[PDB]
Ligand binder design. Sequence first.
Ligand SMILES: Nc1ncnc2c1ncn2[C@@H]1O[C@H](COP(=O)(O)OP(=O)(O)OP(=O)(O)OP(=O)(O)OP(=O)(O)OC[C@H]2O[C@@H](n3cnc4c(N)ncnc43)[C@H](O)[C@@H]2O)[C@@H](O)[C@H]1O
Length: 218
Amino acid sequence: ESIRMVLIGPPGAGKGTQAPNLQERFHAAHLATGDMLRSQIAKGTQLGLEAKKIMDQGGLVSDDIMVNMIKDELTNNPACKNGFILDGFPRTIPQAEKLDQMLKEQGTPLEKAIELKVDDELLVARITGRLIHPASGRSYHKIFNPPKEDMKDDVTGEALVQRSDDNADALKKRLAAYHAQTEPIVDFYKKTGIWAGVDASQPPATVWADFLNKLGKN
Ligand SMILES: Nc1ncnc2c1ncn2[C@@H]1O[C@H](COP(=O)(O)OP(=O)(O)OP(=O)(O)OP(=O)(O)OP(=O)(O)OC[C@H]2O[C@@H](n3cnc4c(N)ncnc43)[C@H](O)[C@@H]2O)[C@@H](O)[C@H]1O
């Protein structure tokens, strides 16, 4: 029950929705670079204030920053000994190449790169209806996956918010960047044989079952 894997998917595909499933199953560190950035933002740090502007425009934060963030976490974070789930990294070919390098040196290569495949049309409704609990990252959807207490993080009472980069202006820039910059990474992993595609247009439980199936564990 150990995994070192990457999650690749467009904005809205369902990475943050499935990761908890993977965490519980494999007890791996969930390293979501979007969550790390948002953490910077909330501490009011300088890196956070600069990342915030770019994120809100549907831009990508620079590779150097993102590689250093991940290198430190792989290195100093003890929870990353059991294995890890990279969520949102790598996001560009250079990050992919540098990650490859890093893991060679550490002698812990990636086992799986799961692509969550889902058409762009669907992704707009998903991003438009999303509410997150900002003090965790718990995502809900107004239509597709409602809080019972509306606008309230059901299990823990706290208030739900919209993400600032979930504006359909940012969203268009987010998708174009995914196709232009991130999608090429999929071929990289196809060529090393650790890629598996998952149908992320299905509902959550059906996607997770497909996941297990694809990991070759369940
Ligand atoms: N490495 C890096 N390099 C450079 N810049 C970087 C970077 N990492 C981060 N950044 C930057 O930070 C920004 C944000 O990154 P990040 O936060 O990683 O966002 P993202 O990749 O754009 O992804 P999302 O979080 O929007 O999607 P998701 O697939 O996790 O969705 P969710 O599960 O919530 O689900 C979406 C919604 O749909 C719902 N839903 C989920 N699954 C289903 C289902 N199967 N059916 C129906 N409803 C569903 C949910 O309930 C929810 O409402 C980047 O754009 C860039 O600026």
